[PDB]
Design a protein around this ligand. Structure first.
Ligand SMILES: O=C(O)C1=C[C@@H](OP(=O)(O)O)[C@@H](O)[C@H](O)C1
Length: 427
């Protein structure tokens, strides 16, 4: 078991040029692959999740080249639905942004492809998406547990009236939205009830528009899609810096700055996680917005009690920042933390208690009361990049912290520790 021990960080200050957005990167790659023309993506993220998407595109026969640092990608669009037969297996690691979108996309036309991934991926739900694709005509088989990957896709999605559950993940609808335009018949996607992680739907629609396709969004309750469309290369496309990866650095400044500036995202960014900055401001930090940067300057840090459904990923960072806040912090409406890289409500509560906090692990919320002083702990990371990055912040105290399996950060941010070190100052 590899581990990394972080020594106490006296102050953080500086500028970080963010790695590309995982959410935007994987959507842009798939749309570029489906599109007509050559797409040049810059600031593409180089991380495990994007690598699994690139590998899947290579296996499907898509041609592309990558720059030395793997952040510039020139993709030759296929000019239509991707295809493979012979039950070709695409191994998708634990990349949900590859698994859900490809599960839908590869149902266009005929195909015989199997999607699988790491053990935990076989425990992350995909039934709501399968249900919706089958209502549209797709033939899909669960090869192991019903409602979970791995899946055997045999095609057949033609469009039509389809309902989709949006209560557990926004990714199922995202996958349907990206796929439906290329289906021969028009599609009307009806959301059954609640829709969580709504901002990710805006990211999907923004990317689809960039690639030449628009749809009729009726109050996020129903989506009208015209069939028979084609995606078109936007030419050169700049991938936004990752606003979720930014949360750690902005929070570090709120706790121990100094001023930390992250570049690559700004006030016009499409990522819902830029709203994480609003939360730090509510806690007492000072925030500055620019066209291509967001900065946070230490002020004070007071506990908050907020519904975090709009920023589920970045919200985890508030769970550890809460260790440094005055009062008890409560994060609500985050049930789906349970069905992500790990059950994040169980994991976060378990590890927070190890450094001294009193924590109530609610079914769909978490309440954190910080200790007078933190103590040393060896933090388990549950093969979850965000558990490692969140707990790195424990070192902004008087105690060191040991993070197990630090390389798990590579899922979305391979250079995380070197970047945190860049802004760490001894004086
Ligand atoms: O579409 C996306 O890029 C994502 C949507 C979110 O998932 P849910 O919709 O399941 O909350 C988020 O947690 C995940 O890391 C990325």
């Amino acid at each position: 078991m590899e581990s990394l021990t972080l020594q106490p960080i006296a102050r953080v200050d500086g500028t970080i040029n963010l790695p590309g957005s995982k959410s935007v990167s994987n959507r842009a790659l798939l749309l570029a692959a489906l599109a007509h023309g050559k797409t040049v993506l810059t600031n593409l993220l180089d991380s495990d999740d994007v690598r699994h998407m690139l590998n899947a595109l290579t296996a499907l026969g898509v041609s592309y080249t990558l720059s030395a640092d793997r952040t510039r990608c020139e993709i030759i669009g296929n000019g239509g639905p991707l295809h493979a037969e012979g039950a070709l297996e695409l191994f998708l690691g634990n990349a949900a942004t590859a698994m859900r979108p490809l599960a839908a996309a590869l149902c266009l036309g005929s195909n015989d492809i199997v999607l699988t991934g790491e053990p935990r991926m076989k425990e992350r739900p995909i039934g709501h998406l399968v249900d919706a694709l089958r209502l549209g005509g797709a033939k899909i088989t669960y090869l192991e547990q019903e409602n979970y990957p791995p899946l055997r896709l045999q095609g057949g999605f033609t469009g039509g009236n389809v309902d989709v559950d949006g209560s557990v993940s926004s990714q199922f609808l995202t996958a349907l939205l990206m796929t439906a335009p290329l289906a021969p018949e028009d599609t009307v996607i009806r959301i059954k009830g609640d829709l969580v992680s709504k901002p990710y739907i805006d990211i999907t629609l923004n990317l689809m528009k960039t690639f030449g396709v628009e749809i009729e969004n009726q109050h996020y309750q129903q989506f009208v899609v015209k069939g028979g469309q084609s995606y078109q290369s936007p030419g050169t496309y700049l991938v936004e810096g990752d606003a979720s990866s930014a949360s750690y650095f902005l929070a570090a400044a709120a706790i121990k700055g100094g001023t930390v500036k992250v570049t690559g995202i700004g006030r016009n960014s499409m990522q819902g996680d830029i709203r994480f900055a609003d939360v730090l401001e509510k806690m007492g930090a000072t925030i500055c917005w620019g066209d291509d940067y967001i900065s946070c300057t230490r002020g004070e840090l007071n506990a908050i009690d907020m519904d975090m459904n709009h920023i589920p990923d970045a919200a985890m960072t508030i769970a550890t920042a809460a260790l440094f806040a005055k009062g008890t912090t409560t994060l609500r409406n985050i049930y789906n933390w349970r069905v992500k890289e790990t059950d994040r409500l169980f994991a976060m509560a378990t590890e927070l208690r190890k450094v001294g906090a009193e924590v109530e692990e609610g079914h769909d919320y978490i309440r954190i009361t910080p200790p007078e002083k933190l103590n040393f702990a060896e933090i388990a990371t549950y093969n979850d990049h965000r558990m490692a990055m969140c707990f790195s912040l424990v070192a902004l105290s008087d105690t060191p912290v040991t993070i197990l399996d630090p390389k798990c950060t590579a899922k979305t941010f391979p250079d995380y520790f070197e970047q945190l070190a860049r802004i760490s100052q001894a004086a």
